[PDB]
């Protein structure tokens, strides 16, 4: 999956960024079974004051998580993943839950590419990884914390 | 909902940003009944020359709106909404309608979380808002303009 | 279509941005028939180390391409399109494919707006251009490379 995380510039230190990204990555892995290295967290930082709620300009506490996933998972599983991302990002950023928005969008895996390769269906991460070439597997393995 | 608003850096002044956020939030609340405080506008500024049309680099005047909605509204409604957003953003930004692009994407409300809570179906935000923790109503109420 | 391209600041020179936008645009045109000037490439830059893969901060190499299309094309065509953007962006940015990620999302054309007009269905672009005003046609014609 890709998680776009929109935050206010300098609201998260490098450490907080690391922690929030490990929080989402672990949640995704623990609930879906997708390998760690298939989960991308991409921080989009903007100047604080670039976020309006009901027209009211915000300080710098709002986090928006747009998660882009393969289709095929249940409403239930996705609900549990969204709630775990709320809880865990709240703890990682030290930001109260009222500031956290999370949207999940899904697409057919056949129109989804990661590391230059088309993704498999959600059950099939193991076979797929096993059939990649050697150097591709090697590159992927180093993106695990 | 969330409206991602991609603009060139230093194209919209803070007052023009406020104006545009208003125009959008007004459009959404007017045409859907969704309470003012559930609509985020999130400005994403890039340096001019980061937008290409047909391979031709642009100046600083393109505006692209990406609206992220709950599923369940009619296409007639959605067309009316996209048209009003074009009109009112064109006026509030003093930008010609030929520079404005607007895409709506939709998701099940069961996988959309705002203020740390799961969103209702599009007609039912009243009873959703009533049944909430007193402090959550209190915070939500402040983000209205 | 709108292709959102998430890259790191300093990664692509101006000349490389041009070459990448050109390759994406020529791929979309050559495989779907949509006129050049309808294709937007929007580069979003963030400082290096904003991307995490599997919880491990990356340098500045990864390229994420989020293409927003209208519905109604085959999975065969979308697979060819994604693979060709991978190949032509890898060549044009002189980046290895293992850094390239590509997601296609689709929406009904009735909720999509380019140059302030509503898009047609994917093969009716000719009649659609032939019912636009003179000045709109001229403005769109200047966006061809």
CA pair distance C107, C78, nearest whole angstrom: 14
Say if B44 is an interface residue toward chain C (CB within 8 Å). Answer: yes
Resolution of this entry in Å?
A: 2.2
- A116 closest CB neighbour out of C44, C75, C100: C100
Q: How far is CA C86 from CA A25, A53, A111, C6, in A?
A: 25, 37, 12, 14
Name the residue range of residue C29's domain.
Answer: 2-141
CA pair distance A47, A45, nearest whole angstrom: 7
CA pair distance A46, B59, nearest whole angstrom: 20
Q: How far is C5 from chain A (nearest CA, A)?
A: 12
CA A15 from chain center: how many Å? 17
Per the structure, how many domains does chain A have? 1
| Residue B105 to residue A105, Cβ atoms within 8 A | yes
Residue A70 is labelled as binding a ligand? yes
From chain C, the residues in CB contact with A111 under 8 A are 75, 78-79, 82, 103-104
* CATH number, position C137: 3.30.429.10
**Where would I find the H helices in chain B?**
14-32, 75-93, 125-130, 134-142
CA pair distance B17, B92, nearest whole angstrom: 9
Q: Which residue of B21, B42, B129 is the best one to mutate when testing the A interface, meaning the one whose CB has the most A CBs within 10 A?
A: B42
Q: What is the CA radius of gyration of chain B?
A: 16
For chain C, what is the HEC assignment?
CEEEEEEECCCCCHHHHHHHHHHHHHHHHHHHCCCHHHCEEEEEEECCCCEEECCEECCCCCEEEEEEEECCCCHHHHHHHHHHHHHHHHHHHCCCHHHEEEEEEEECHHHEEECCEECCCCCCHHHHHCCCCHHHHHHHHCCCC
* Elucidated via: X-ray
Say if A127 is an interface residue toward chain B (CB within 8 Å). Answer: no
Partners of A70 in beta bridges: A107
Closest residue on chain B to A107 (Cα): B107
A49, with CB counted inside 10 A (0-12, 13-18, 19+), is middle
- B46 closest CB neighbour out of C2, C39, C44: C44
Say if C22 is an interface residue toward chain B (CB within 8 Å). Answer: yes
CA pair distance C9, C46, nearest whole angstrom: 5
């Amino acid at each position: 999956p890709v998680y776009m995380v929109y935050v206010s510039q300098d609201r998260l230190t490098p450490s907080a960024k690391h922690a929030v990204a490990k929080a989402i990555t672990d949640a995704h892995r623990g609930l879906t079974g997708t390998q760690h290295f298939l989960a991308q967290v991409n921080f989009q930082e903007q100047p604080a004051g670039n976020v309006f709620l009901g027209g009211v300009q915000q300080g710098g506490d709002t986090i928006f998580v747009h998660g882009l996933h393969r289709e095929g998972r249940s409403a239930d599983l996705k609900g549990q993943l969204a709630q775990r991302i709320v809880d865990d990002v709240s703890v990682a950023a030290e930001i109260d839950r009222k500031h956290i928005w999370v949207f999940f969008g899904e697409m057919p895996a056949q129109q989804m590419v990661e590391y230059g390769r088309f993704l498999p269906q959600p059950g099939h991460e193991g076979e797929w990884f096993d059939n990649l070439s050697s150097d591709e597997r090697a590159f992927m393995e180093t993106n695990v914390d």
